[PDB]
Amino acid sequence: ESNEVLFGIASHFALEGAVTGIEPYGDGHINTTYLVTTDGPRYILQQMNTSIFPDTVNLMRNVELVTSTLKAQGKETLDIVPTTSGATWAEIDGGAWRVYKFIEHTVSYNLVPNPDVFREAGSAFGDFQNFLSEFDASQLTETIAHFHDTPHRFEDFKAALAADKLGRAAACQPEIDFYLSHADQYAVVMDGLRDGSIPLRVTHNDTKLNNILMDATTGKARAIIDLDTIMPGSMLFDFGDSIRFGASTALEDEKDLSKVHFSTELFRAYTEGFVGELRGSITAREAELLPFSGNLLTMECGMRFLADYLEGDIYFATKYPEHNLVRTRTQIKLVQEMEQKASETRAIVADIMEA
Ligand SMILES: Nc1ncnc2c1ncn2[C@@H]1O[C@H](COP(=O)(O)OP(=O)(O)NP(=O)(O)O)[C@@H](O)[C@H]1O
Numbered sequence: 143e144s145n146e147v148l149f150g151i152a153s154h155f156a157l158e159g160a161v162t163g164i165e166p167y168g169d170g171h172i173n174t175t176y177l178v179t180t181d182g183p184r185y186i187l188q189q190m191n192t193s194i195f196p197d198t199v200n201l202m203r204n205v206e207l208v209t210s211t212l213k214a215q216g217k218e219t220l221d222i223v224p225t226t227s228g229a230t231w232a233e234i235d236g237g238a239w240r241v242y243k244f245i246e247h248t249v250s251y252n253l254v255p256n257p258d259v260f261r262e263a264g265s266a267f268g269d270f271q272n273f274l275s276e277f278d279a280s281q282l283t284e285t286i287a288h289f290h291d292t293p294h295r296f297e298d299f300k301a302a303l304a305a306d307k308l309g310r311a312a313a314c315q316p317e318i319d320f321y322l323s324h325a326d327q328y329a330v331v332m333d334g335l336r337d338g339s340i341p342l343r344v345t346h347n348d349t350k351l352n353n354i355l356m357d358a359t360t361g362k363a364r365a366i367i368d369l370d371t372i373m374p375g376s377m378l379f380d381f382g383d384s385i386r387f388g389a390s391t392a393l394e395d396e397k398d399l400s401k402v403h404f405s406t407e408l409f410r411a412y413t414e415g416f417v418g419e420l421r422g423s424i425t426a427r428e429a430e431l432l433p434f435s436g437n438l439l440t441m442e443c444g445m446r447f448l449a450d451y452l453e454g455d456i457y458f459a460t461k462y463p464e465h466n467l468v469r470t471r472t473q474i475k476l477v478q479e480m481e482q483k484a485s486e487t488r489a490i491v492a493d494i495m496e497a
């Protein structure tokens with residue numbers, strides 16, 4: 143948006159300083175995020191993506207419930223800055239906008255620099271699972287249906303493939319055939335949720351590493367952000383998605399595949415932190431599926447990148463025409479290595495579950 147438009151939006155909110163700038167900020171793919179600089183405090187301004195989250199009222203109800211529950215336990219979280227009339231968000235000229243306080247003195251990572259950082263991530267999301275267990279499913283309505291319903295995602299992928307709107311399929315047959323060949327593997331968690339062998343839990347559902355802000359001095363997790371997808375699911379969605387993003391030796395959009403590897407050392411570090419917090423609640427069946435949850439969420443995310451490529455990049459923000467194909471390729475490479483290391487990761491979980 144133009145400066146005039148953005149400064150107008152900012153005037154709707156109860157900011158505590160004169161605005162000096164509003165500039166696009168961050169590595170988010172979904173909403174449109176801006177850093178608001180003032181003569182004092184900083185803020186994050188977001189235009190919510192209503193094509194992805196059409197029910198803005200229900201989304202903000204969830205975010206308000208979660209954050210207010212955290213605040214009422216004295217725990218740092220996203221602090222909604224209300225409109226000047228007290229609302230949690232504003233509809234302005236056909237757009238939905240919200241503001242959060244900028245969480246100060248933090249660092250975050252798109253790539254794990256050392257195992258200790260990833261262990262801390264495990265602890266943070268493991269702790270968040272315990273926190274979320276205080277809610278029953280009925281209090282937090284789904285903001286996106288079938289969100290980690292991988293067979294449903296696969297139906298969407300197949301439709302995108304058959305349509306082949308842009309004629310992009312010709313150049314990515316190996317990637318396409320990887321997802322088609324693994325069709326048999328996509329239902330394991332959904333089947334377990336449906337038959338009761340996997341507990342339905344309230345989960346975060348987007349547990350990539352850069353959704354944890356860590357303190358710049360202590361290195362400890364300060365807050366979990368990106369709260370839009372909190373809804374019922376399986377623990378395995380949170381665990382798997384964390385491994386997908388954070389157990390890689392490379393960025394999600396690394397162009398050089400020779401740099402992309404699945405690290406069992408990082409897998410171990412995360413699992414130590416995560417299971418360390420959840421040892422009391424994790425069932426036998428959940429533990430059995432911990433390694434495969436990595437494969438599953440990486441395949442789901444990968445297929446979603448490739449479907450989006452085939453559809454002309456309507457879902458995820460991209461920086462260049464082939465960006466989503468570059469992204470799907472890293473996810474495939476990762477899964478190829480998770481398959482190769484399946485015995486090793488099984489052993490890691492068993493070791494941790496005992497000691
Ligand atoms: N309250 C905050 N304080 C400081 N930084 C923030 C805050 N909220 C968001 N950010 C930063 O802005 C980035 C994008 O925000 P986020 O809410 O993850 O965007 P999104 O597009 O809605 N979802 P995603 O594509 O999953 O990252 C984050 O990675 C952080 O760097």
Ligand SMILES: CC(=O)N[C@@H]1[C@@H](O)[C@H](O)[C@@H](CO)O[C@@H]1O
Binds near residue numbers: 171347348350383394
């Ligand atoms: C609401 C939504 O679709 N969020 C997605 C998440 O599912 C996906 O795993 C990630 C990939 O980087 O990007 C976004 O955060």
